Ligand binder design. Structure first.
Ligand code: NAG
Length: 246
């Protein structure tokens, strides 16, 4: 398990949480010095539990698939909540079984469905540690529309930050003031699968991507990533989605 407390949180403690989160994900090899997530894991070992505490010390436990860092569901007091998708229903066989009741959320966990439920794209949803505190509080009591927005915040401030050092840093900058994600942040989130694939394809292609990945950089300028010498590969990405899951 890993834990994060919003009470007394600062960029340092958040950095420690994201480090813990990354380190809780198993891998047997690195590709270009980046941990390669496993093709599969059987049983309960597939799911990492993240214990998150809001500023007041109330808590949810979030279940995360360790092969892809996808959030499957969460536990709030005695109620479990899972995304309406087969991977989450499968997860519900292994985690939070002691919950008094299980609610299946009225959407899957992918960005497009969540944004539809929340009534806005995540370009317009502020993120940061204060937003995470709010998200935790929102998820404590069921409200599916509110929860969609909270989950967009949660996914980006946990999973996406674990995947990309740039995103971790963006959240650290928003430790005491929320701000909508940078266009670069959105670009990286959208490109994680693609990048993971091309980095793995580069292993037998002399470090060269079979297909270039287009990203937006820190200054809003759109760029092409063509090989493993790019800063996105050497410095930024921290976890690779196994190509067997792409
Ligand atoms: C690879 O990427 C580097 C750094 O971005 C770039 O300058 C160069 O043109 C590319 N080289 C090859 C062989 O693709």
């Amino acid at each position: 398990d890993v834990s994060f407390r919003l009470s007394g949180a600062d960029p340092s403690s958040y950095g420690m949480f994201i480090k813990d989160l990354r380190n809780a994900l198993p891998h047997t090899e690195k590709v270009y010095n980046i941990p390669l997530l496993l093709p599969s894991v059987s049983g309960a070992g597939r799911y990492l539990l993240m214990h998150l505490f809001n500023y007041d010390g109330n808590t949810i436990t979030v279940a995360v698939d360790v092969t892809n860092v996808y959030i499957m569901g969460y536990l709030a007091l005695t109620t479990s909540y899972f995304f309406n998708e087969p991977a989450a229903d499968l997860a519900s066989q292994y985690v939070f079984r002691s919950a008094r009741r299980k609610i299946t959320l009225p959407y899957s966990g992918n960005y497009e469905r969540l944004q539809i439920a929340a009534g806005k794209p995540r370009e317009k949803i502020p993120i940061g540690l204060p937003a995470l505190d709010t998200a935790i509080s929102t998820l404590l009591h069921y409200d599916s529309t509110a929860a969609a927005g909270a989950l967009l915040v949660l996914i980006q401030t946990t999973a996406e930050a674990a995947r990309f050092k740039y995103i971790e840093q963006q959240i650290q900058e928003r430790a005491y003031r929320d701000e909508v994600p940078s266009s670069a942040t959105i670009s990286l989130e959208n490109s994680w699968s693609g990048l993971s694939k091309q980095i793995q394809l580069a292993q037998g292609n002399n470090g060269v991507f079979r297909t270039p990945t287009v990203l937006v950089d820190s200054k809003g300028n759109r760029v092409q990533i063509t090989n493993v010498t790019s800063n996105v590969v050497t410095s930024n990405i921290q976890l690779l989605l196994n190509t067997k899951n792409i």
